[PDB]
Each structure stands twice: as structure tokens, then as C-alpha cells.
Write a protein that binds this DNA or RNA. Structure first.
Lengths: 134, 134
DNA sequence: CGCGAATTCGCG
DNA sequence: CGCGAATTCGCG
């Protein structure tokens, strides 16, 4: 607002929602793929992007980066700030993996500090988030 | 739609919300007070109107009435149909009374049948619900 | 299509 | 003012 080009953009990829979910973190300016999560059979868009932002936080923290993270998801950003992923997705055998990851990402947020700013990507003005799965 | 005048209208009365709540059931056409609940120190508008509709159901069922009930509350009507009062109000010592009543009204709905239609009062067209506490 | 936040609605 | 449903929003 305007744009920190030297940043990490995190994206979620969803077929049906709920359904197969994956995510990745990319360099905002170049589009270089910095990390990617192999598809999880059942999750939601919001769960996936929550995990993406937390994966981003961890990736930047261990590399001592001052870089911010951009997400186009009001929801995932709010969940990260709250340290709580308020998903409606049922907890059952089929959803146990995503919920395990989510519960662990929440635990990470509850037990760590980070300086990374988490910024909203303004799709209407800046086009789509870098490397959007679309 | 239009109006069954021979009916029971149930109303909730609220100061602050949450705060002191009361309710009553009145004859729609005349305004005669058919039952009234003395003020409960802490509740919400929606909890109070839920209890009002269930009190109405019980009052009509035991008098073998075919009369419908009108409520202006989308929320309380939906909760009665679902047999579940989805209130956000915290459960603590101060709210224990209203929550006790609500939990018991839910149990009543889970263990009884009734033929009473529960109809939406159209305030925009028919003016305010009969004897509105306003 | 669905997921959830934000916003709008009707109410006392 | 707050309570919650319904609706609108942005997203993949």
C-alpha cells in the first residue's frame, strides 16, 4: 500500500472446497518458488492458506529475514493474528491430517515470536497474488 | 401473510443486550396478556425470545389450541425449529439462570411434538408485534 | 460450488 | 449499544 516487492507471497490451491488443497510461497517480484506443500487430500481454502502463512513465518524466521508476507486472504491473516484457525471443517478420520497440521501451526504461533509483517495483497489494484494457482 | 388474528404473539423486552430480559405472550387481536416472565437479571434478546416461543408452545399445547404463534425474530424462530439456541452468551455464574432455562427449553423441544405453526410477524406491513415492549 | 469475514438487517 | 441470521465479499 503500495508494494514491498522484496517479500514472500503465499498462495493456496483448491479444487472442490472442501477437497484437495496445496500451497506454496513465492518471491513476490520474480515468482521464484521458495517452498511448496504437496496436495493434502481433504482440507479447505482457509485451512490451507493459514498453514501457508505459518509455513512462511517459519521459513523467514529461520533465515533471519525482515521480508514481509503477502496473502490475499482476510480470513487466513486474521486467523494467524488470533493464533486460532476458526474452521468449520468436521474433525473425522478423513480430515485428521489437515487438522493435525492446523493444530500444530497454532501451537507454533502460541510458542514463538516473529517480526514478519503479514500484509494484505490488494488484488483489485495489483493484479493477482504472485503465481496464483487460479 | 396475511394475518391470523386468532393467535398468540410473543414478545421479548430488553434494556442493555446482554442485560435484563423479560417476555410475554399476548392475544394478537385484543392484546390480552396470557403469560409473562418476570425479569431475568442477565440474558440476551435472542435467548429471551427463544424461551418466549417455547413457553408459548407449551401454553398452547396444554390447552389443546390450534392457534399459531407470531414472533418478529428470525433468529428465535430458527432456533426453535432447530431445537437449538445458538447463543454466544458466555456460561458463567451470572448467566447460569438464563442458560438453565434455555437448556431446559431445548430439552422440552427434543422430547415433545406440537402442531402449533410458528409464523413470522411482518412488522414493515402490519406494524409492531402486538404489545411490543419497545 | 463451498469457506468464513465483513456487512446489513431487524429488533429492544 | 449488542445479538445472531442473512447477505455480500473475495477467493480457488
Amino acid at each position: 500500500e503500495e508494494i514491498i516487492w522484496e517479500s514472500l507471497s503465499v498462495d493456496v490451491g483448491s479444487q472442490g472446497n472442501p477437497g484437495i488443497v496445496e500451497y506454496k510461497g513465492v518471491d513476490t517480484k520474480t515468482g521464484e518458488v521458495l517452498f511448496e506443500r504437496e496436495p493434502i487430500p481433504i482440507g479447505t481454502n482457509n485451512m490451507g492458506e493459514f498453514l501457508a502463512i505459518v509455513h512462511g513465518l517459519r521459513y523467514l524466521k529461520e533465515r533471519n529475514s525482515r521480508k514481509p508476507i503477502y496473502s490475499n486472504s482476510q480470513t487466513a491473516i486474521k486467523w494467524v493474528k488470533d493464533k486460532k484457525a476458526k474452521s468449520t471443517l468436521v474433525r473425522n478420520e478423513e480430515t485428521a491430517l489437515i487438522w493435525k497440521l492446523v493444530d500444530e501451526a497454532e501451537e507454533w504461533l502460541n510458542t514463538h515470536t516473529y517480526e514478519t509483517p503479514i500484509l494484505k495483497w490488494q488484488t483489485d489494484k495489483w493484479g493477482e497474488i504472485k503465481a496464483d494457482y487460479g
